Amino acid sequence: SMLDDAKARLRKYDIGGKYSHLPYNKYSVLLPLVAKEGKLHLLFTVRSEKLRRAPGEVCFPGGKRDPTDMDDAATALREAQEEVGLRPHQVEVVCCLVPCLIDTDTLITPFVGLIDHNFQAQPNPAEVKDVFLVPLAYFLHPQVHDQINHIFEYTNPEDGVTYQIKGMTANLAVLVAFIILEKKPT
């Protein structure tokens, strides 16, 4: 099936707990995979205009590890629940991808999660202004704009709204798209 095929490709890139104990300032992100109308999509958030770190930007659900978290995957699931109301029975965490190093003292660990078909996002307005889906295949032929820095523009055909996706978030999307969609019969 489409979903079994996805998890099997994703598992070949799992680095597991290899880098998880290093003494960094630690953040996790959830890369939420949704199946809709026969195809895979990623779920994104637009950050509230109120936040100190990066108001108004497109990002994956996530945030800073705290003393309650049993492990880095727990940080990502705690944070997704708080931002968009995703409960634990509604997500299967399939792997841990390569972590992202920033600012000399920070390590961001990405987890890929398969989302239940009956999940419906409840955006928390203190943290997220909007939630939207993008088909995974878009990231193989994106509409690119240069600000030199590469920016993706995605227009939702449901309503004509344009979102800008850039930086680490855009890098991770392309990575997931490659892993899952490369080399497939049609």
Ligand X SMILES: CC1=C(Oc2cccnc2)C(=O)C=C1
Binding site for Mg(2+), residues?
Answer: 79, 83
**Nearest approach, Cβ of residue 121 and ligand X (Å):** 3
For residues 122-151, which are near ligand X according to CB under 6 A? 131, 133
Q: Which is nearer to ligand X, 107 or 165 (CB)?
A: 165
User: CA gyration radius for the chain?
Assistant: 16
Query: Hey, what long-range contacts does 98-104 have (CB within 8 A, 24 or more apart)?
Result: 98/13, 98/15, 98/175, 99/15, 99/19, 100/168, 100/171, 100/172, 102/168
Stretch of 20-28, 91-99, 117-125, 152-160 lying at the interface with ligand X (CB under 6 A) = 117-125
Q: Is 43 a binder of ligand X (CB under 6 A)?
A: yes
Stretch of 5-13, 63-71, 112-120, 158-166 lying at the interface with ligand X (CB under 6 A) = 112-120
Distance CA 36, CA 46 (A): 21
Distance CA 117, CA 35 (A): 7
Stretch of 1-9, 53-61, 100-108, 113-121 lying at the interface with ligand X (CB under 6 A) = 113-121
The site for ligand X, by CB under 6 A, has a size of 10
Which residue in the set 10, 40, 121, 176 belongs to the binding site for ligand X (CB under 6 A)?
Answer: 121
Q: Is 120 a binder of ligand X (CB under 6 A)?
A: yes
Q: Which is nearer to ligand X, 119 or 178 (CB)?
A: 119
Distance CA 162, CA 145 (A): 13
Contact 28, 109 (CB under 8 A): yes
**Nearest approach, Cβ of residue 93 and ligand X (Å):** 15
Closest C-alpha to 176, from 3, 4, 9: 9
Distance CA 105, CA 102 (A): 7
Binding residues for ligand X, rule: CB under 6 A, are: 34, 36, 43, 115, 117, 119-121, 131, 133
